[model samples]
Target: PVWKDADTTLFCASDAKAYETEVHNVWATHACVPTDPNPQEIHLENVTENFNMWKNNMVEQMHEDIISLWDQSLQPCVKLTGGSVIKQACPKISFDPIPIHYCTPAGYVILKCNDKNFNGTGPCKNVSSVQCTHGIKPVVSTQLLLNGSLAEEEIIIRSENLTNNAKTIIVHLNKSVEINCTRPSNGGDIRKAYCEINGTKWNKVLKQVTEKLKEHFNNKTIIFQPPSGGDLEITMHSFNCRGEFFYCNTTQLFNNTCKGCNGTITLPCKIKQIINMWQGTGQAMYAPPIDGKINCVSNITGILLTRDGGANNTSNETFRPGGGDMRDNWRSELYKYKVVQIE
Candidate 1:
């Protein structure tokens, strides 16, 4: 990739003439290209094998296509794509200088976002942002309160051709209904009456004891009958309930310094304003002084010259491919790097 009269690019003129004819057909069929000046074999007493050296695959696929089309198409970037969707329901969202930079598709979540892949790190680490839904649906209500609750305490009443049906029905459903007493205040009477019921629940527990057995004594139903005829046929066996129940559950802010320098980036916007440097889609190092270059698109696509300051919205400032244009209306994407630079 040659053409360094002070190389600093990003110019998309027909994909910079198709990456200048794919770097001149890998410089006439790759003799092993970094422009192959007999490259890749430096054990200079092993300064960590030349502090990270791998210049092949066409400059590492143009730095993985400049970090996947402009620094992660805007961060876990889970920020500022927010202004709606129930106001991002239950949102408190924060991280990065954040001023909005895409992710607004809906369902979201992220927290430790990264983008590097081999030596210096990054392969989807923090994937942060975009998650909305405020308790989508949760509701349950039941309250009538009191009377030792939903009574079933003692319900035993019988009627089978009355051989003097010994009456017995008592419930604490709590609302009111009664039959005082008559269970032998004087011995020997197969017919009796001892009932008391009150209900608000438990299937309306005999709605106030069926209006006290449809009361009508002198009219001659004569106290639960049997004064002359019998056959009160009734059978319900099972009671003892005293209740309770309930249910429910369950960007950085990255290392920065906009204009000076110090790595770790991604803060597209929330206003930190000032610090833009570019000319590095593979150029070579910091040029921070005014070509803030139309304020660097997509907030300075992770500006790195080789590293940092360069902070922007979402506040992630780290793009050091510096032809050094540190700040002010500058947008240079004039590509022409066809393999050949071992300087």
Candidate 2:
């Protein structure tokens, strides 16, 4: 009889202990082998189990890590050039890594993808990790100062980012003034210098004025005498009471009297000296006197209208006659005498 239940075994012989141990060994050996004779079904089942484990360990983990990096590194969008790259939108997938393009909000495709494989024939084996960066456009600003203060009356505005050449600015002022910009020397983030609008142009105007003054007074010399005595010689065009004599207004004189004339008269004169008449802790005074004289000349006349002084009273206290030789020796005495009648 076949012993189907090995745990409960009975023998008609007297040696039951040895028979029971032999039955236990046979049960352990049979449990190790498959019950069925065909091994094809078992082999196929094992292959299926191994493939599922590999999928979870390798493919799924790689996909999860890539997704994590994408979420952390990718920016929403990027800037691009103003023109179009492609006329039509092309869509394709790659087993090998290839550059992919995407459109931003302004109807332009600016995506720069990393192509790990140049030819898209195989799996993406050597794809590099992507890094996303947001582009920043350069910006520039300007500030103008006049005599170390902000020029409010001068209508000037700061400029934005300089996109092209031909950058020009305007400054409004009734009179010309020195102006300069207070800006950093470095290009800053944008890498450009602030425009020099006022200082450069103002310097040019001043240079032109100096050049013109030199050209006009290149060879002219003017000599005039005061009411008292001595010669006043001026070789250059002056802003003061020198050079070719002109009429001095009422505000220019102190006592308003010169030689024989008093209280405004046509007098041929030049300011020989500037005297600091009075000075105190908080006050001071100055006067431009006619050369070696007690009074100031109201106006200046040409050299031809004067003559040298003589013994008589007529030549003693007035301008000299016209059409005389105005040599240096004669000039000192010429302006002391009175004018001779033209008729």
Candidate 3:
């Protein structure tokens, strides 16, 4: 007679007893096999749980192996690159800057002046020091070309005036690329003045600026408006100051005069100390009393304009591009990144 209701069996072993007594209940049994006389029948409901458990363990092991590989293999390669990699399992490792390539050997980087392309020349010598403003002379101006093609250009924008306000600054980036604008001192209305790219406005976004430096932004225009007009200043809250690297138009701090005119221009003047943070720390680090002749060199990276002080350093006061040297030395920090990886 076939057992229709249920069949219960008790099974126990010395190893099994360690966990618990094993009781087996044959809920339902059917001879559904057609290929063989003896067939193994699986419980339909229990199959899901059993398969899920096996799959879960396998997935968990795979995840563990992957994490282990990342730590052992990937992390070590990044470390070999001089801490250029972003930290994941450990704290961020901050160090000096590293030199990478703008392009392969076939390509070239050049600097331009007066809207003329200078190619084939090395990165440092591509563009001569041209008068950037009415009175200001350029310290550095060069373009980066890939395979005799223009990729990018870096020109030092200096204030021609020795007084607080310099002539309106303008930078022409041949293409739409990321840029940073920094005015070290003599802070007043440092405007981007807009770039004519694609017949539209191309301005900079202040990733970081010193405490003394002020920044302003309007659509594609970033300017420095020094603090002025007492109550109007009162209306603008601290949050308005946030992300604003451009200074507001205000009175002079040292001379105690209002923004605008104060003194005459001078030759052999140092441009305002501006930090090029994108160059990375250590190597690109610089400080103040920014002169028009300071130069920097990198084997693969090419020569860039040097700050008055040095890389990752700052001066007490920033020398305007055409202003005579000032007796001020402030300590400012520079943050340079070789590689900024996003995961």
Candidate 4:
């Protein structure tokens, strides 16, 4: 939720504390309050024709009480402009992001209301599946939490069947959202200027091979100026681990580092042992596909394809952070799924 990169990019940086405070409060107040009910459709970057089609689909799939927050990656530019439609009093800030209209979040949480009269054979009471018209909460009619993206739509269900031991499952559901990548200077919506990853976009740099790519860096924050020539394909490794596997740590991943064409070892490498606390195998773990954007830079160096190519560094975080408790309340446990893949 913190946009550290935005500390430098916001046009309203002078009044960032105030503006961010005000806007955050504004969202907090309305996040649980009652408002309108009709779906407010928006014209997004990817869709070429009627947005109604997309809007209708979302409305059908949307839960009643979902609250979404704008992602840090889109904080400075994408959702701030208040847009050309959804007329409302634009907030007093350098960029006009109307809170009433845009409640953009990387994704949303939907709660399941499981009832055991789950079925009634009388008249219209006998339903094949649960009708979830009334969700965990309510939402304002004019505000929608889509970021104007056709990216991965994860409908995380806050399951109510836990008491019944119904075996909670996390499955990908069909729904739609969008992302609008615009310029920071004027907030003008642009298309095709650059490519993206994890929903964060970057303008391309002069094509450089791995050697030249790592030369200009003073630190990891120096995102390598990657070439925008043909493909967006590149190898990936977790912070210190080689081959596959990444930290998936929320902030360290997005502090804005850049990648070169190949690999050049960064320093402080060598992951000790991720055993059964030490009794483990070569069955290395890989990070899951990111469902939406958080924060990012272009740097993919130091992560090696081999020992010699990359640098040494301490992304070896299987070491601490959880300190042995491993209680994941936030549900970033794609690690659990990999281990249970036979199902």
RMSD, each candidate, Å? Answer: 38.7, 48.9, 29.4, 23.4
Top TM-score: which candidate number? 4
lDDT of 2: 0.20
TM-scores of the models, in the order given: 0.13, 0.11, 0.16, 0.17
In model 2, the Cα lDDT at residue 294 comes to 26
Model 2 weakest lDDT span, ten residues long: 136-145
lDDT of 3 by residue, 106-204 (tens): 111111122232221112221211111011101112211101111245321212221233332222123332212222234332322111111111112
Residue 235's lDDT within candidate 4 is 17
Report the lDDT of model 2 for residue 8. Answer: 12
Q: Once model 4 is optimally superposed onto the true structure by TM-score, how far is the C-alpha of residue 178 displaced, in angstroms?
A: 16
Off by over 4 Å in 3: 1-90, 105-343
Instruction: Note the Cα lDDT for every prediction shown.
Output: 0.19, 0.20, 0.19, 0.20
Q: Which segments of candidate 2 are over 4 A away from where they belong?
A: 1-174, 185-195, 198-204, 215-343
Give the worst 10-residue stretch by lDDT in candidate 3.
Answer: 328-337
Give per-residue CA lDDT, model 4, range 1-343, as digits (tens): 1111010110000112323444433443545333225433222222211111111222221221122322211121112122322222312222122222212222221111122221101112211211112211111110011111111232232222312322221111123212122112222221111112332221121112222223322222223221222211111112211111122211222233444423222211112122111011112222222222222222221111111113335321110011111111111111011000011
What is residue 18's positional error in candidate 2, in angstroms?
A: 99
